[PDB]
Amino acid sequence: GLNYNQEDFMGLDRFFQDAVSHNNTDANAASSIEVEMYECDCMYPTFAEIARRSGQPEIGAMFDAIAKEEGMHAQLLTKLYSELEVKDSAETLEAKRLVSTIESQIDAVASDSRGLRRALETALEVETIESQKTYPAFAKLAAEQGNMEVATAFEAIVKSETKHANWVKRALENLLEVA
């Protein structure tokens, strides 16, 4: 065989960040807020710039639209936990550093067709994990704990992240269709 799994081109897969599981729903909300704001603030704007600089403005507009919706998810949870003090974990700080190293190479990243391909594939990876695993698990726990309002919020976030996965897949299919 190859003898190893190659890491993705330019480390773009490490843009994906997952919320951390806890026993307590306030802490799951805090972790979600953290990650969703990182995607709103940092991840998706960077993907949008890769798209634009690759000559793909429509896909860039999609990433800008998704970014705003990640902020909506965070703001719903903030409304429910008004007093929470959310801080970036080590892993979010590392991801923000990575974002800044791609920004300072943005021209090279975009000029290679893998830049945008891997950005879309990383978006798909997070939207998949969020929609199918992480936020269903948070919704289930919140319900178990009798926290109906927060369970309902996570169920709405699940719906939205599922939509994003669909958007991203359709965009990937078109990106890769030349004609």
Interface residue list for Fe ion (CB under 5 A): 39, 70, 127, 130, 161, 164
Residue 94 marked in a binding site: no
| Residues with Cβ within 8 Å of residue 13, at least 6 apart in sequence | 7, 118, 121, 122, 125
CB of 125 or CB of 127, closer to Fe ion = 127
Residue 127 marked in a binding site: yes
- Minimum distance, C-beta of residue 70 to Fe ion, in the bound complex (Å): 5
Looking at beta carbons, which residue is closest to Fe ion? 164
Residue 164 marked in a binding site: yes
CB of 63 or CB of 105, closer to Fe ion = 63
**Cα(70)–Cα(172) distance, integer angstroms:** 20
CB of 112 or CB of 129, closer to Fe ion = 129
**Cα(34)–Cα(41) distance, integer angstroms:** 10
- Minimum distance, C-beta of residue 144 to Fe ion, in the bound complex (Å): 23
For residue 60, give the amino acid letter. Answer: G
**Cα(177)–Cα(70) distance, integer angstroms:** 28
The answer to whether 10 and 46 are in contact (CB under 8 A) is: no
The answer to whether 83 and 128 are in contact (CB under 8 A) is: no
CB of 34 or CB of 39, closer to Fe ion = 39
CB of 55 or CB of 170, closer to Fe ion = 170
- Minimum distance, C-beta of residue 107 to Fe ion, in the bound complex (Å): 27
Lookup result for tokens 């970014």? 67
- Minimum distance, C-beta of residue 176 to Fe ion, in the bound complex (Å): 21
- Minimum distance, C-beta of residue 89 to Fe ion, in the bound complex (Å): 16
**Cα(147)–Cα(77) distance, integer angstroms:** 13
Nearest 10 degrees: Cα torsion 70, 20, 14, 38: 30
Q: Which residue numbers belong to the known binding site for Fe(3+)? A: 36, 39, 70, 127, 130, 161, 164
Q: Which residue numbers belong to the known binding site? A: 36, 39, 70, 127, 130, 161, 164
